[PDB]
Amino acid sequence: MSDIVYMGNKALYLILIFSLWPVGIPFGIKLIGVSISLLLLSGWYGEVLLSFCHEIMFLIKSG
């Protein structure tokens, strides 16, 4: 229904954005860049995932 489609689209958008930055920013240089990006954006990644899970929990509680 409505919320199911919203959740699916949100999950796809999260996949898109999470694959966007670290890839978009020399295999060893690529690896060190990925590591630096993970170190810098780990808090933002975790907070976005936690906010998404809180949305899920609100939807569960509403029922």
């Binding site: 959740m7 999260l14 694959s19 990925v34």
Partner: peptide, 25 residues
């Protein structure tokens, strides 16, 4: 329904990690 709601963040994390590993080479 609630199971489907619960699986979404975990599958998102799995796909993100898979993409990172593949893009690594």
């Amino acid at each position: 329904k609630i199971g489907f709601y619960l699986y979404l963040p975990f599958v998102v994390v799995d796909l993100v990690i898979s993409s990172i590993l593949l893009a690594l080479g």
